[PDB]
């Protein structure tokens, strides 16, 4: 779930992006050096990709 | 009965121009610039009331403005502009026997 606090804290950082796990896109996953997923986010992407 | 304000607006400036000085010293007429819409009666009344002289007659002519051109450095570039000077009215006022200036 998009935690508004984290999103606010991140959106002036430099290389850091915060997503919703329904807003992931092919280019973003390749562009950034590292991807951090919360476990529930992994579950949502699991069911979404089926 | 031309009102005071009209009179205070008609007489613009005395016109010094050699032909004016000779006219003053020979024919006892002063030469002066007047509002382009001034009529002879207006100039007569204005001169009489504002200079406290007694005038005989007024002759008027309209001088057409020349063209002068020069430059303006608006925008950094000195653009050559031309335009027309403004037309004006010249009055030859013949005083009777007085003297003002």
């Amino acid at each position: 779930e998009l935690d508004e606090n984290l999103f606010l804290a991140a959106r002036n950082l430099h290389k850091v992006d915060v997503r919703d796990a329904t807003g992931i896109d092919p280019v973003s996953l390749i562009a950034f050096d590292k991807v951090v997923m919360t476990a529930d986010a992994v579950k949502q992407v699991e069911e979404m990709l089926a | 009965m031309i009102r005071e304000e009209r009179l205070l607006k008609v007489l613009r400036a005395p016109h010094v121009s050699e032909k004016a000085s000779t006219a003053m010293e020979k024919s006892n007429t002063i030469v002066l610039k007047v509002a382009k819409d001034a009529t002879k009666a207006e100039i007569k009344a204005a001169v009489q009331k504002l200079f406290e002289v007694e005038v005989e007659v007024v002759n008027t002519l309209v001088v057409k403005g020349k063209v002068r051109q020069m430059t303006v450095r608006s925008g950094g570039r000195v653009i050559r502009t031309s335009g027309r000077r403004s037309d004006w009215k010249k009055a030859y006022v013949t005083l009777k026997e007085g003297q003002n200036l």
Binding site: - | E4, E5, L8, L11, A13, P14
Partner: protein
């Protein structure tokens, strides 16, 4: 300047306007004749004439 012309009546406002117009005429004569190094009273007299006429319009309406 408008503050203490606003509490005159209508006739001495008219006399004030006439005095201002006379001053304007003599200033014009001086400027033409080459005197009047104080070449700033012309703007002053005209702004005061404007002010007086504005007040006259205000009171007569």
């Amino acid at each position: 300047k408008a503050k203490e012309l606003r509490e005159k009546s209508v006739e001495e406002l008219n006399t004030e306007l006439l005095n201002l117009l006379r001053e304007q005429f003599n200033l014009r004569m001086q400027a033409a004749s080459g005197q009047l190094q104080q070449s700033h009273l012309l703007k002053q007299v005209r702004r005061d004439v404007a002010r007086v006429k504005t007040l006259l319009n205000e009171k007569a309406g």
